[PDB]
Amino acid sequence: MPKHEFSVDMTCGGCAEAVSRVLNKLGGVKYDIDLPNKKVCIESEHSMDTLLATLKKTGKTVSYLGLE
Q: Which residues carry this modification: N6-acetyllysine?
């Protein structure tokens, strides 16, 4: 299980729903949303690529920065 970080731009609270729902839709991913700092962090065994490809489809500023 790695950890990863992503910047987001929660331009409405519902952005968090959008991202949450898209990750959830992928399957069994522990994602964790920070609205004030405008980030998502994820720590689940779904491959980074798979996630980063999936979540992409939201077409928001959900940008990738971190591997741990």
A: 60
Is 15 annotated in a binding site? The answer is yes
How was this model experimentally determined? NMR
Flag whether 41 is marked binding. Answer: no
**Domain span at 59:** 1-68
Residues linked to residue 16 through DSSP beta bridges, in sequence order? none
d(CA 46, CA 48): 6
Q: How far apart are CA 38 and CA 61, in angstroms?
A: 10
Q: How many domains does the chain have?
A: 1
